[PDB]
């Protein structure tokens, strides 16, 4: 169906330890395909998926120069942001950047992103129209005025509406066996006793791709939620994902609780009950 | 393919 490509950048200053660390990763949907680690020895953009290894040297030389340019830019931001917020030189601080594009089932442009954070808090973000900015605080207004004079939004828009979706369609074609697959979940239910007069009913979903899935619990027909524990979707290590949802029910009210799972690998939302 | 433009210091 709909797909996306995103790049995640993390820069951390380490005053009491040494030089800053820079980590960059690229994703197509929930599948990472490239990476760069400033602490690694290669100092190159490295493949992380089989379908990206076919790219020629001009790709790996070009991505490496650009990912180094990102790191060198974040290295300047660390000093600048430390001045913007009157912070000491002895503390460790984090710069994070995320950008990418979404496409629909027709692989055409849907939405572009470019978000920037400092110390885990929003700093400046490109608006949906790809022509204006949202400054989080008053110190970020300086950056907003600087990037508007540099016409940064026009350059990002040309990438998000053009280069981003063009390479995304190329990736989806080169890795059709991997990216365009849909692994159906493998569901089962577990049951244990919490205390007297109480029991646990856990609804499992294993080996499904993509990571998007919804698990809800229901009581003899009605949506009885917000009294339940929902664990976040976790990776299994082989390209698939896992997730579970457990509800607390009386020791005798067991067979009046349904769990409804729906995944794009399932033609119709599944339902299960204990036993 | 990552950005080759629009990356400016804050």
């Amino acid at each position, epitope marked *: 169906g709909s797909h996306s490509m995103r790049y995640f950048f993390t820069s951390v200053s380490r005053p009491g330890r040494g030089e800053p660390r820079f980590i960059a990763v690229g994703y197509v949907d929930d599948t990472q395909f490239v990476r760069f680690d400033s602490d690694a020895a290669s100092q190159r953009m490295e493949p992380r998926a089989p379908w990206i290894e076919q790219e020629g040297p*001009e*790709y790996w030389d070009g*991505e490496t120069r650009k990912v*180094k340019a990102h790191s*060198q830019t974040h290295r300047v931001d660390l000093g600048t942001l430390r001045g913007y917020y009157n912070q000491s030189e002895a503390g460790s601080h984090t710069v994070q950047r995320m950008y990418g594009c979404d496409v629909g089932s027709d692989w055409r442009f849907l939405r572009g992103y470019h978000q920037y954070a400092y110390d885990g808090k929003d700093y400046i973000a490109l608006k949906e129209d790809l022509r204006s900015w949202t400054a989080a605080d008053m110190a970020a207004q300086t950056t907003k005025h600087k990037w508007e004079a540099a016409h940064v939004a026009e350059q990002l828009r040309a990438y998000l509406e053009g280069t981003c979706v063009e390479w995304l369609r190329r990736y989806l074609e080169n890795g059709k066996e991997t990216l365009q697959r849909t692994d159906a979940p493998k569901t089962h239910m577990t049951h244990h006793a919490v205390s007297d007069h109480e029991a646990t009913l856990r609804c499992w979903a294993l080996s499904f791709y993509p990571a998007e899935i919804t698990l809800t619990w229901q009581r003899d027909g009605e949506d009885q939620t917000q009294d339940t524990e929902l664990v976040e979707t976790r990776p299994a290590g082989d390209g698939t994902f896992q997730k579970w949802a457990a509800v607390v029910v009386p020791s005798g009210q067991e067979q009046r609780y349904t769990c409804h799972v729906q995944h794009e690998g399932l033609p119709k939302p599944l339902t299960l009950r204990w036993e | 393919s990552m950005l*080759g*433009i*629009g*990356i*400016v210091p804050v």
Partner: T-cell receptor
Amino acid sequence: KEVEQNSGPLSVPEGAIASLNCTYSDRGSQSFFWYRQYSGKSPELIMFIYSNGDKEDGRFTAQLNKASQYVSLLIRDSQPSDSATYLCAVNFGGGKLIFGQG
Amino acid sequence: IAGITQAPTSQILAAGRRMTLRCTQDMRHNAMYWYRQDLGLGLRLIHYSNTAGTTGKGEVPDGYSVSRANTDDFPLTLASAVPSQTSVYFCASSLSFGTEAFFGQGTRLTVVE
């Protein structure tokens, strides 16, 4: 080979449309530039382009097609002042801004 | 009044001597470039710099070296003058990597034996 331009010199009558083209090898290039350099002077920017399609600026029109990996420049109403060497510049990532032969 | 300036504008070097070409810009540009242009081809990238404090290698870095101690300056230094280094050297700068480059006046350098 990385950036190959129209091989000249091109003789164009006064008033004729002068067509210049430029091919590049890196399919991932994201910014493209046309410069004008008079004899013994510095390269002066004519226009830049980031996206596929046309871009017009007076008598100058640039055209980019990433699929064919070419960028072209058409000069209408060729004046005598247009007599110079026209340079094509393509960014190969980071600071690798490479020029053609002109 | 903000622009990019090269110095010197002309220089005649005896072979074997070292030489440094000056280049400075006050446009708050992060990226700077050095090119050489001979009467037989076009511009060839010698060295580049994306930000202050970093450098990179261009098309023909052999025989040259650069430093980027601050944002404004970007000197090009010749280790040992060779007649093959006789050319016209252009310094350029861009706001950031990938954007349009603004060139300096140029330096006519001739290395004679």
